[PDB]
Amino acid sequence: TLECLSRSTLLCVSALTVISYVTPVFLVALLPLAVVCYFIQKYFRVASRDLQQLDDTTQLPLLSHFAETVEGLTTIRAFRYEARFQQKLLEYTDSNNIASLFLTAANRWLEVRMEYIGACVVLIAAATSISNSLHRELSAGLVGLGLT
Amino acid sequence: RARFVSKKGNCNVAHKNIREQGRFLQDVFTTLVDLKWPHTLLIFTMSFLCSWLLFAMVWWLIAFAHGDLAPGEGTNVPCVTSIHSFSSAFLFSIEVQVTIGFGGRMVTEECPLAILILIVQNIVGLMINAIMLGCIFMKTAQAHRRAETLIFSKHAVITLRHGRLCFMLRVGDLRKSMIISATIHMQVVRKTTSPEGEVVPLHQVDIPMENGVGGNGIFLVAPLIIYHVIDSNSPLYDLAPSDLHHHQDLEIIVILEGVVETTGITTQARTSYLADEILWGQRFVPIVAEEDGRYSVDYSKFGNTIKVPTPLCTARQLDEDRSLL
Amino acid sequence: RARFVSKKGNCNVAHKNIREQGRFLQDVFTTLVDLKWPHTLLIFTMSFLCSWLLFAMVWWLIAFAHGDLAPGEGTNVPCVTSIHSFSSAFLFSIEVQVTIGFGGRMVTEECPLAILILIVQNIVGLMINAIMLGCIFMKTAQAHRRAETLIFSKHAVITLRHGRLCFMLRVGDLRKSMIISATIHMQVVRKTTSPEGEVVPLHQVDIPMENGVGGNGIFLVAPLIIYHVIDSNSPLYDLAPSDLHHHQDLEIIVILEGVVETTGITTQARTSYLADEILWGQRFVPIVAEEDGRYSVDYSKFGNTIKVPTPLCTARQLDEDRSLL
Amino acid sequence: NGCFVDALNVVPHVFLLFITFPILFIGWGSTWLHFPGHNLRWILTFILLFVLVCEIAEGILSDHLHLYMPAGMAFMAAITSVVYYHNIETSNFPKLLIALLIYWTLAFITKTIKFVKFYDHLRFCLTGLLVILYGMLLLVEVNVIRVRRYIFFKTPREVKPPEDLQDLGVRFLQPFVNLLSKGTYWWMNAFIKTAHKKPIDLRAIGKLPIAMRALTNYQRLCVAFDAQARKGARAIWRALCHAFGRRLILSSTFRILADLLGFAGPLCIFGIVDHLGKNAYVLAVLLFLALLLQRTFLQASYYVAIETGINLRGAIQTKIYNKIMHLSTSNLSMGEMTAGQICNLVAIDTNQLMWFFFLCPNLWAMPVQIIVGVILLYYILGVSALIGAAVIILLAPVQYFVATKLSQAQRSTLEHSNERLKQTNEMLRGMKLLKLYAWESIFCSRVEVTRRKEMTSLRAFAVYTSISIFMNTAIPIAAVLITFVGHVSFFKESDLSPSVAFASLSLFHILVTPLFLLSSVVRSTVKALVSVQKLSEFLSSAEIREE
Ligand SMILES: Nc1ncnc2c1ncn2[C@@H]1O[C@H](COP(=O)(O)OP(=O)(O)O)[C@@H](O)[C@H]1O
Ligand SMILES: Nc1ncnc2c1ncn2[C@@H]1O[C@H](COP(=O)(O)OP(=O)(O)O)[C@@H](O)[C@H]1O
């Protein structure tokens, strides 16, 4: 994970630097992208922290219950309370599942809006390219770098 | 057998030997409003087109009669300038009637007869426009759709509350809009024979709605079971539990009156319960439930019913047993 | 915990499992009136512009189709004289629709299709004008701003009057306009369990408004504390003073009904008081004061309250002590 | 009379846009009812959006306002049809549907007239597809009236909106929303906005849907397990793959479509560069649309994979908890049914099976991806394909051998860590007696020796992964260099226009990304294999004997 993160951040740096070099005008369209992305990341951060905390606080009691059922076997199978204990475990596992599901759903939502942000940036990067680097800049080699 | 007033609220009794001559065009002016929006739009466009065609015909006739319709240059001025055929005549009629006034065809100061036909055309048009506006506004003001939402459980039950036999029946609202000062007039009909040898074919008697210290009205927010307790003084106190299901003919009607908020009109809902409809010794399922942070009402259990181990006996014999126990 | 009806007067109970198909365009004709004056003006201009543009488009189309839009001299007469582009077509549409009739561009008696489009344009315009006038007048007639002024002190108190425990709660007017025949329906809700094993989730019961010989109504000029005395027959007579503050769930609602003067509609105000809202053993400060030559009412002391050395005990135990003293 | 037919087409869009505004403004001023063809309707509406973009492109190429207005009007007409269908999904009516049906019929008529007048004499295709799409939406509307109550006899016999996902008390609605929203998780908006206003709680978050409860997953899983038994470690694996089924397959199909579009992007780059060297803005718009579409479908695939994984976790958790009941204490006395061993089972197998079931749809698209990559790069390289082909064929077998040498270390790693955990368990529950007469050095040296063996396994794994990354970078760069040098001067004699160069670099990067990933995938793959072997040996413990 650490190495993939480093590779991806260096790729992002390279791409931003290349696009800035090919079209010195793009620095007028980068700050709104950064601002909107920053605000949405800030909004996602608190909800993500809350969902992770709730995930942990529901995941602990399920494993406590598992251990206690495993050790105190004879008593539970003596009372013949097995229906009650299975119902209890069903309750706990359903709560665990919903917590995990909401965490991953928030993850997916942030990813989707980030991909829309990336679509915006690549779109208007290519648009400013096809416009400026052809009409007024008249440069050929920079187009390939920019779009790639 | 025959019912007194139907479940939907409409009346069942059909009148015979009515007199004559009722509704001399005023109740027809209101029966017109009563008709459904499509039929009312149809009759409105019908009236308008009828008047338009009538006056178009008379204008074509007068232009033909003066000779101005005969195409000729000089020795005359047409009473209505630039009129050629029936089409332009109808165009002039719709131009002067609905008050658009194109002015391509001009009525002139040569013929006073055209002046008279115009001076009657305009006033009749204004009068028909005024009635057709007032009537559509009057029709618009009502709200029947808001009125027909009153709901009463299909069958009513009896139970034993506070050691006394009681009548339980559900009412309720179906929209956000409330109903102000809703009162209950609970009545019972029966073919009765007086001790003086007089037989009445149907006898309405008020059975009380048991509320607080007094009051004939209630307050409707959630489905509230109307709670009455039959006592030795009540007229319904004499019947038996095994004879009601099949043979007897007893109609218990409720009349819930109340004024709606937005319109301010006083509507009501009337419903009947027959001898074969009502049943014995049961209990409704609790509707309201403590939800997340509110009260949840489930209308699926509205007409649901559970068995209750309650004694089955007649109200007179039940009162005698209460005197004995 | 959950409340029955909110302080502002709106209802809190949320319905579930409602049926279907209610409000088949008539309740939408009234929900339109309900919307705020800005939204209603927006939708009115929207409807008008929609119809105008629709018929302008169809007129430009028909003038294009006949070939009269193709600029040519002779061999034809345009169905609408002097029509050149879409701009003049829209001008003709607004000239014939809203019935101004400039008459610079004249519809002729050569094309009956233009006659038909005009004869439908005018009737649809008249119908939409009639509905948009009736609806704005109907909306105008109401007065909600006059309705929402009812005020009830935030918390109600209990005191000892005439040797009996009593309920004191302030009401009042906020405008010069009076309210005719205002009646009080004072009710209490509670989750009750009958002796027959029946548990109700909420139980409305009428607690009387204690006035003269009779009467369910009052007269509102100045803030008048509604005066009720709980007795052994009252449903509220059984509670305790130390258990109401925190644990118990008792909602005491008041429903003040009455018809306003100028409009004649019957409005009402509903408010709730919880177990944690109501307090014990206090007295309101006298509002009215003998001014220079009138009576001055100070609304700053409306919700103010002073301590009173009154005994604190349950109403059942208080009645037992009254039997002992 | 071309302009005449253009106007005749403009008319019905205007009619619909004018009737939509009163109703839309009343509606703009909690039971979801769905109709058959809903998803088909939204799919067709997106196809309409695309074809309308193409029509606008044609209108730009030709220009004459009245000649390209029909596209700009059908655009708002389709968006307003979407608004109508949202207003009908939220509250059902028999009349709004007829209001749509009228417009569909009239638009079909106008398009037919256009087609005839064209036949008598690029436009043809765009127009033909338009007519076909209008016709299919018409058939959908006819199906809808055939179903419940457009005019049909008296009562709809209407469904009674679904209580499974509409039951009071539910917060999570993925299955209970509209076609277009599921991709974006628009429903989440409220929730994420709410969370900031008030902290989140378990009573805040809802319950689980009808089709999400662990009871039904356990039910399905046991039914499949029984069917498999009537026909061991392999059997339960077959049962798992069977049970998730169609959802898992769908996740794979979404990923494959996303992959084909992801390859499509670089082709648009090639076209843009070629026109820059010399039908270009269309390339930008189409490229933007393609990128957006790939992102949407990739995220949907990830979501459905996660769904399948969480359901797997729930089902196997409840299955092993039910089986713990019938387990006999004579197994509990043995090391195989150690309590610490069973809790390690639950926790780490939840983890490993969930991670493998998130990464399995990702690898069920690597083969199709690489195949399409090479079939695309042939048409771009030409006779210079041999070098890249030899490179990406020389990559595979050495990678297979490296992965084998990796898995062998990883399995022994797991065995050693599993014994270390039990040594720690028996070390911590007796720290009192341990510190009492100070036997610490012995147990600490034993755990240190176990840690050293585990570290040997880990260092073997790490050296092998380093060699893997070295290869996965060195072979690619050599490939690019060789191919380009070969084309320019070695044989081809056709000057590589920069478009070819950059498109090759793009496709090549797309090919490179999966290879780096598969090395990490093996780490979860052998772990899933080991976890299932352990789970099957745990299920094979001694039963309790019924009287
Ligand atoms: N869930 C509901 N929501 C609104 N109205 C209802 C509902 N169920 C029934 N109604 C109406 O109110 C009346 C209540 O009767 P009901 O309890 O349904 O007994 P039944 O099922 O035999 O008709 C019915 O006549 C029906 O028209
Ligand atoms: N001076 C006033 N004039 C008019 N209305 C008032 C005045 N004071 C309060 N009200 C309204 O009437 C109600 C009386 O409650 P109040 O006596 O003010 O207790 P509190 O101060 O705790 O709100 C309040 O809800 C308020 O909206």
Author numbering:
A (entry chain B): 1139 to 1286
B (entry chain C), C (entry chain A): 32 to 356
D (entry chain B): 24 to 52, 63 to 96, 103 to 160, 167 to 276, 283 to 329, 354 to 622
How did the manuscript describe this experimental structure?
ATP-sensitive potassium channels (KATP) are ion channels that selectively allow potassium ions to permeate the cell. Specifically, they are inhibited by ATP and activated by Mg-ADP. Previous studies have established that the functional KATP channel is a hetero-octamer composed of four inward-rectifying potassium channel 6 (Kir6) subunits and four sulfonylurea receptor (SUR) regulatory subunits. KATP channels in pancreatic islets are composed of Kir6.2 channel subunits and SUR1 regulatory subunits.
The third structure is the KATP channel in complex with Mg-ADP, VO43-, PIP2 and NN414, a ligand combination that favors the NBD-dimerized state of SUR1, which is solved to 4.3 Å (abbreviated, Mg-ADP state). We observed similar “T state” and “R state” conformational heterogeneity of the Kir6.2 CTD and SUR1 ABC transporter module as in the ATP + GBM state or the ATP state. Here, we refer to class 1 structure as the “T state” (the tense state) and class 2 as the “R state” (the relaxed state). Similarly to the ATP or ATP + GBM state, the CTD of Kir6.2 in “T state” has a clockwise rotation (~11.8°) relative to that of “R state”. Moreover, the ATP binding sites of Kir6.2 are also occupied by ADP molecules, and the Kir6.2 channel is in the closed conformation, similarly to the ATP + GBM state, which is consistent with the result that ADP can inhibit the KATP channel albeit at a lower affinity. The ADP binding mode at the inhibitory site of Kir6.2 is similar to that of ATP or ATPγS. Because ADP lacks the γ phosphate, there is no direct interaction between ADP and the γ-phosphate-coordinating residue R50. This explains why ADP binds Kir6.2 with a lower affinity and the R50 mutation shifts the IC50 curve to a similar range of ADPβS on wild-type channels. We did not observe any density at the PIP2 binding site, probably due to the low affinity of the 08:0 PI(4,5)P2 to the purified protein and also the negative cooperativity of inhibitory nucleotide binding and PIP2 binding on Kir6.2.
